[PDB]
Amino acid sequence: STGSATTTPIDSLDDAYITPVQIGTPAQTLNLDFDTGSSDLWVFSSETTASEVDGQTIYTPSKSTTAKLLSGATWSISYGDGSSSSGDVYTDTVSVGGLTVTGQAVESAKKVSSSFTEDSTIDGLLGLAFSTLNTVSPTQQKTFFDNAKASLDSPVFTADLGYHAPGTYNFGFIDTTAYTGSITYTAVSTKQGFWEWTSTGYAVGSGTFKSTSIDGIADTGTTLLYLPATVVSAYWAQVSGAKSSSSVGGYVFPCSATLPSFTFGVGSARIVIPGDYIDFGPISTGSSSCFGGIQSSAGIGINIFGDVALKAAFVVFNGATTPTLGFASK
Ligand SMILES: NCc1ccc(C(F)(F)F)cc1
């Protein structure tokens, strides 16, 4: 089997991407943030605290004839940005672009944090990291990809995120028309439950490529590109007037600047992020200082190849018995 669904930025800055997902019988369609950095499929629901719902579409399990309460199961998740949610668990039928899993664990939110309430466009998350990170207790549950894998034509899914435009998540096949050149595959460590890999280096604009190993995760659920402080300083030093702002919480730059590109290595291959992808717009409405799309990972503990990096590439999440990651230009 295969599945294919269009993913759309939630706003004019590509802060996140939403993909429609069918849940239950009859179908309830919710727009979920597909997150290769986490492993819980959770949704705003009829059970979510009323004051914490502000325009999201809710899943109502009592209206789904295939929904079954997973007895005694609860979940609670905290993300690296400080956001969180928690609730109880149903199993139900879940479909993405024609690909169907019966008995998928659907985590129904009873509580969500302020950042979720304030994003009216995100009805929940669909985790695509490794199932070892799933938070359901006392019986851990599998991701949608993990459940579908054996039925897929190939045990893979691909992320083709757009810059200021729609893109595609495919399950079970590689669309060879969706990229240029070849896909370079690189090793993955699953030891922390992430799609963790090692970039072979970087360049800033037309500068000399620096060969250096950068361990990090491929994370569609994170907006920006978080890299070591030395790398990030080298990038922003090329932008006249850019500086690290402690009040703002990262590097900012004059909105009048044209940004240099940033290149990252995948084996001997190179992925070029156009400079415009690195502009995240005014720090506050009407300001002429703009927030940078490449930020230091120093306070995080891990480097994150978030959407800024991934949307420059066609990305293969290969769930073969030894998982690997593939990157192609596009
Ligand atoms: N990395 C997962 C994630 C995704 C979205 C959000 C937000 F911004 F919608 F709350 C937070 C955390």
Residue numbers in the entry: 1 to 330
What's in the article?
In this study, we used the aspartic protease endothiapepsin (EP), which serves as a model system for other aspartic proteases that play critical roles in several important diseases such as hypertension (renin), Alzheimer’s disease (β-secretase), malaria (plasmepsin IX/X) and HIV (HIV protease). EP has frequently been used to develop principles and fragment screening. Many fragment-based and inhibitor studies have found diverse ligand-binding modes in EP and, of these, ligand binding close to the catalytic centre of EP has been extensively studied. TL00150 binds to the active-site cleft of EP, in which 240 ligands were seen to bind.
A surprising fragment-binding discrepancy was observed between the cryo-cooled and physiological temperature structures, and multiple binding poses and their interplay with DMSO were captured. In addition, we found different binding modes for TL00150 between the S1 and S1′ positions in the EP structure that varied as a function of temperature and DMSO concentration. In comparison the 100 K structures only show a single stabilized protein state, which could have been introduced by the cryo-cooling procedure. However, at cryogenic temperatures protein plasticity can be limited due in part to the higher energy barrier that needs to be crossed to allow fragment binding when compared with room temperature. The difference in I/σ(I) and resolution range between the cryogenic and RT data in the highest resolution shell can be attributed to the use of different doses.
